[PDB]
Design a protein around this ligand. Structure first.
Ligand code: FAD
Ligand code: FAD
Lengths: 481, 482, 479, 482
């Protein structure tokens, strides 16, 4: 029985590996090119972020608390998953794990309404989960050499929350996939073919047709656009946008690196500052985030400067004199309703693994096992049912909660710069931002409100793009009510 | 009576008092006001004899603004003989009224291009049109200045015969000249003007006394309209005047030096600006902030003092940083609600007004004095003052659209003048989000009247009750004149 | 008895003498103008734990000064009761706050602010003082710029503030009630012969006889006594620690319920707000050691004071009305420690060189000197601070050179500056050599503390050479 | 042999290769170098045809600097025919070498007055002295630019006929023209020049081969002196060349637009500068940082990338902020230790050098190529270039005092160009404390030689062992020539 996995990121390869190992009866073919155009995974550090990803806003919603529980469950799978992938290689392939622990730093280069609230939410989430952690003296954090005006005054050590080399992970997944009898076919899917409510297979961009009983779409930010061509699915699969992220590999001045992940809490519009250790005198610094209504594969000047400025001031001034090896750009799959698209469709044999935004790589072994269990007639992981791909848009927050959040995040872009303004200006800007965002939210839809990250993108998009989204929301409402 | 009472002891009241006393030796002229000069604009002034230095693109884009500028140019011609006539009543030991003959206008980048670049070009054009002597000079040739390099000027304009006076020595010379001409000083305040059968009878003072008069000249600064508005019908016939609260400072320089000229920028956000006026005895005057306040204020805010000092130390001379602060001065520019002065006669026989002169009453004083004295003698005074008669419908010198463009530009200029450091997308975001609220305010205040930018920002950030009282005021004025 | 000086120390000792010796005539000199007066420019904080620095507590002399500050705090409640007792409700309240909050923000050098916050916490724990580290969100009233906000806060119970003006009025009233005489003239000269005080010549030409003269003339105290034979090189010099503060009427008439402060910052300046009655707050306070007196604020001092308060404490102060810029001279002793007690001249006493905390220590210092004048031994730990002494060397030259470079760099971080990231390390490297060369040139044995060392570094060559001569003459006298 | 080997495939090697191949059709010319162009200056260049734009007050204060400037002016005259002759060997699809005809020099306050104001005046003086066509223009008339108002220019200078080329299209045109003239491209590096009996024999390549030749022209950029220094005595007879590491970037503009002219500042701290060179197809070039490194570096630092982008987005066009980064480019300007190029013949028969051209070798290339080809043919080439012969005692173009003033000014300029915000006493404090250490370094390095400011800062912040090796180098040069 033929299975085609569309996409060669962490999610496609993780599901490919689990099918190939688990299902000796199926021939599994994985599509995607070595260039990995718009690929999130190669641009990732990556942090195995569960507690580090906690925000007050996320944990204020039932859907956010459910997503967090799944991130905590995923962390338990990583040690055996890494062992099983390194087992198919040798010493020369390098180590997947680059750090065991994370330090979260609190500095004043940001908004109190995000950074202070989020630091308290991380502490509360760790205490509630009984996770091992300690608030530590900043003086005890090794390696860091911040600008004194940008320095942390509080620090939180999270034990067993670490990082992987995303490049070594991708290489280990491909090697493990081939060892288990998987086939890599380096072309893109152009079209999923279906008739009589069942997948027939995939047309490739070299003109070929590949037959299959099962198609798993794990094409990152392209996943919904690929499935939306099939009858009715345009308004039944929530849209996925590009959360364009910029990161960099730097060769440090002295070849040193920190022993732990160093990070802030999530910041304005789900960007954040972090350093992930790498082998061989390299560090990863990340990572910007901007929701784009169309794909973008190149860094902007603004993104590169903000990333470098935050890292050199808030983490280590020695990075200033360090050599830039690579500016990396990738698209976090940004779901329009703020939650992932994991599981089966109304089309027999059609599955989706996408819309994982900031933490698909961390959740990958859990999500892979879930979808593979479903494909085998199992029930997979409890609590992933709410994130089924064919659904009405989730409304995880009130319009009022989102309007408060989008104004706070807008103001946070100033405080994170950090700006220097006359003291009356911030209050003036807060007062004049409220009305326009309230008017936009009211005009977009009577029922759906986009989360803050997408709402700012819509606010500053062309009138034609806003009108097309008004029509999309109206057609979704029609379909599900 | 043929007795004259001048209400007010600032530059305007004393200047008119001197001109009346010298021109009518047959009549008794009495001047009211106390030596404290509460909220007094004149003692807080440097002061610059600003004509060309006061030019803005926005002012010269209106007919009323061009008329106000023509009068400033005419006033400048009177200053040399006026000063000679005042110093003539004193001796060398009284000190010199004039502290500088010339002005240098500096162009730096610590401000909005839409104000500073437009205003510098407007000053150059106005000087050329008036055939005034001036030269664009090398910045390196400007005497004394030692700016922060990131705050330095890259262009400089020397204006010949546009100078400064010591406002304290001017006030002393005016009082001395007033007494020498037979004027009487009565150091009390007027509480009420008495009139009946369309004619002034005189003035009740705050010690309970009644002083009779055939002529009353109101030059009481920002209190002038409140004083006249008590008389029948005049409450909606005399445009309101608000307090343009200005902060300045006297500094003893580190080495006792000072520049040989006035140093200034063009007028900046909401009619503030940066200037240094030389003084004798190792002192310099630095000014000056401006904020229209709906009620009087007699104390500097922290924000005003810091902005004044920061601009002077960075843009003029870093040596001022180490210099000793002698005095923070606060005074009220009389800020007329329609943006133009109140000069001349009333529907009440013998009642005259000299007020609402905002930034340049001191500069215009010899011209305004001669104008009102000519009118009191049955003359027509100075040509082009007619539009600025005190009993009038509110002037609309600009379109609502021109004022809305100006108030947004001035708001943005408060950022660039700080100077702020922001992400590059933020200024355009703030411009876009400022437009709607200012347009909504303008539309709500009145169908016919629009306050100038300086007052519009004060109204925007005032209490709902103060906005509603202004809506009622505008409606009552409309009723009275239409 | 003649007390020379009408600040907190002179009036406090005057009150204690007049109350304790009703048999003796006590006359207090000084003018209502209080030229260069430290006391009227003070908030004032009853600073014991708030004044703790890592540098101070690293020396034996610094630990002794701190112990005395802790002892002084215990005397304040009864002292205030005894002074308010001589007045009525209409005189106003001396005490303006009971408690202090210390804020830690990043608008400063880690090497000062982080070290000093840890030192304050340690000193509170060691003294068993009641205190709590609190959530910043729980600090009432404050509205900082988010980029200037505190991330840690420390509530110190029973460390409060007084209105310095109401204290001065209460001391004068209490002095008169106890039979003291106020003579509003200055002393020009102390007269002594056969190793004994005869009295004081005043600036109106008069001679006032006395068996006892107590010099509490603030920053003028040593210059006054140095005229007497040999005392020029036996009484440590006192300089002017010129301080700028301000009274502000708040936008809404509100004020905080506690003192709000940082730890001491570059060259012993600091940021604090002291509550006052009637919709006023006190903000302070700058500090610059000047080799000559200065009675006017500089532009730079006024801007630094206002900028720190509006950003780090409350943005609402920006729109608040300036009522008064105050300037006073902290008596800055050349060896960093006060001059308290008796001299080799019989009947000649000194109370001076108290720098940042003479007002706080006043009831303890007053009782000490009055005990000594009565043949007692006063307070146990004050002996090292006797006014007739060789200059104290409380720190190694190396410790002071590290401190002066750290404090110089802290003037940048406290601004706060924005510079290319290589510049701070470049400036640290190029500051070390010149300060080491200055220290080596001034003397083989004495090193001025950082606050005075920066003043000497940027003074005229003639002023440096006069100090080299002074240090050499002191060495001669004592070795 | 009569065979010629050109060692190096940058603008200078290819330009000389083309001129030899075209002028000596009888001889085999082989050009060495790899398509990677490791550390290559030319591919990282915009490039500006900078003659007047490169003028500084410091350069024109020395006789050697005035001679270098005269040669840059002469080179400009050759470019039109040179470009025609190179495009002639291609077709329409190869694209155009010339990307702009004119340059605008902008003066803003994001820099030190002691560099930017002095250099702007020096450019104006040099244009007037040369009778070159130019105009000081209104900043409002400069097309395309959209600066941050706090970073905006207040003066602008239009230089007619001073333009730019696409360095990539130039390199492709030079290779094609070299082949068309009968040149051979051998894509390997030289490891060693072989000579005996005072004559070149040829070149050993890094693939182990030996290539015989009668003539070897070394145009290996910053590697040129290290290659020749192996030959007897030449270690102390050919001035050292260091790496002037430069960072630039190609950006796809938000709307596909670009300016019609080069936009630039005068040269800034340690011979960095801000400029935008137009490119075809919706791309712009922005440059360019400069740091002398004692060892080669092939990667941009974080600091360099941020400074380049921040200056361009604030001072030229805020729209670049939202523009897509296509490429960060890094190349090594050949930085001669005595500040002047190494052009011409050696004491070794058939050995020639074209190197040490720092910021303007690409601009001078057609003149330098014709000069060396004339010398190889027994001519005297171009009149003023004999002073820049490669085998020489180190030039001392400035007094030690002039260089100590310059290095302190340039150090302070790194602050003002950031731009920093500091307490007003700090800059004077840092100036005072920088003077002593730079004077001590200069005194310790040598009794006779002083490195120019750009190299002096690199030496100041290098390891003690690197300083000691330079002291030995200077002593060995002194020994050799005195
Ligand atoms: C800057 C950055 C930092 C990050 N940091 C972290 C981190 O710290 N921790 C963490 O857990 N995660 C991190 N992530 C990643 C995040 O978890 C993502 O949600 C996750 O990588 C998504 O994986 P994916 O396989 O769904 O998508 P991708 O990784 O985008 O993979 C999809 C692949 O499919 C290919 N494709 C597209 N269309 C087709 C088609 N038609 N046919 C075939 N192939 C196609 C694409 O080229 C691509 O290679 C980061 C991402 C970014 C951009
Ligand atoms: C800005 C500032 C803030 C402060 N804040 C605090 C604080 O928070 N807490 C605290 O505890 N303390 C504070 N202090 C004060 C500090 O404690 C001082 O050490 C203390 O006030 C010194 O008091 P004194 O009486 O010795 O001097 P002063 O208060 O200066 O009194 C000396 C008096 O003697 C007079 N005098 C001088 N020469 C003669 C003469 N020849 N004859 C007669 N009279 C003469 C002077 O005019 C003056 O009035 C502050 C001081 C300043 C300047």
């Amino acid at each position: 029985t033929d299975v085609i996995v569309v996409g060669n990121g962490v999610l496609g390869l993780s599901v490919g590996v689990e099918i190939a190992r688990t299902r000796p009866d199926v021939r599994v073919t994985l599509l995607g090119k070595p260039a990995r155009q718009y690929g999130a995974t190669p641009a990732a550090g990556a942090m195995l972020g569960a507690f580090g990803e906690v925000t007050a806003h996320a944990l204020a919603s039932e859907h956010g608390r459910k997503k967090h529980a799944l991130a905590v469950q995923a962390q338990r799978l990583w040690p055996e998953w890494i062992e099983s992938l390194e087992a198919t290689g040798t010493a020369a392939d390098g180590r997947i794990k680059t750090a065991d622990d994370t330090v979260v730093l609190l500095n004043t280069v940001g908004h109190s309404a995000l950074d202070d609230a989020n630091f308290a939410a991380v502490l509360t989430a760790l205490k509630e989960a009984n996770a091992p952690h300690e608030e530590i003296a900043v003086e005890s954090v090794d390696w860091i050499d911040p600008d004194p005006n940008s320095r942390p005054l509080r620090a939180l050590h999270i034990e067993g929350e670490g990082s992987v080399d995303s490049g070594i992970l991708l290489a280990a997944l491909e090697r493990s996939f081939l060892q288990a009898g998987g086939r890599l076919h380096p072309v893109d899917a152009t079209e999923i073919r279906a008739s009589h409510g069942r997948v027939e297979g995939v047309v490739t961009d070299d003109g070929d047709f590949l037959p299959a009983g099962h198609v798993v779409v794990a094409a990152g930010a392209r996943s919904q656009r690929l499935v939306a061509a099939l009858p009715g699915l345009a308004h039944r699969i929530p849209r996925i946008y590009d959360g364009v992220g910029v990161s960099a590999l730097v060769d440090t001045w002295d070849g040193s690196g920190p022993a732990t992940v160093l990070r802030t809490s999530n910041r304005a519009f789900a960007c954040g500052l972090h350093l992930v250790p790498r082998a061989g005198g390299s560090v990863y610094i990340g990572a910007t985030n901007a929701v784009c209504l169309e794909p973008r594969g190149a860094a902007s000047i603004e993104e590169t400067v903000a990333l470098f400025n935050c890292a050199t001031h808030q983490l280590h001034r020695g990075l200033n004199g360090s050599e830039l090896r690579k500016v990396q750009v990738g698209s976090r799959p940004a779901p329009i309703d703020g939650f992932p698209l994991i599981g089966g469709t109304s089309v027999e044999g059609l599955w989706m693994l996408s819309g994982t935004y900031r933490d698909g790589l961390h959740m990958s072994p859990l999500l892979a096992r879930h979808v593979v269990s479903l494909m085998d007639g199992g029930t997979g992981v409890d609590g992933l049912r709410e994130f089924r791909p064919e659904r009405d848009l989730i409304s995880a927050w009130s319009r009022e909660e989102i309007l408060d959040d989008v104004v706070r995040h807008t103001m946070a872009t100033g405080y994170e710069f950090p700006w220097r303004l006359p003291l009356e200006w911030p209050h003036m800007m807060e007062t004049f931002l409220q009305g326009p965002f309230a008017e936009l939210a009211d005009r977009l839809s009577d029922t759906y409100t986009p989360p803050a990250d997408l709402m700012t993108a819509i606010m500053f998009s062309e009138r034609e793009q806003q009108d097309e989204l008004i029509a999309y929301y109206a057609d979704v409402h029609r379909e599900w009510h």
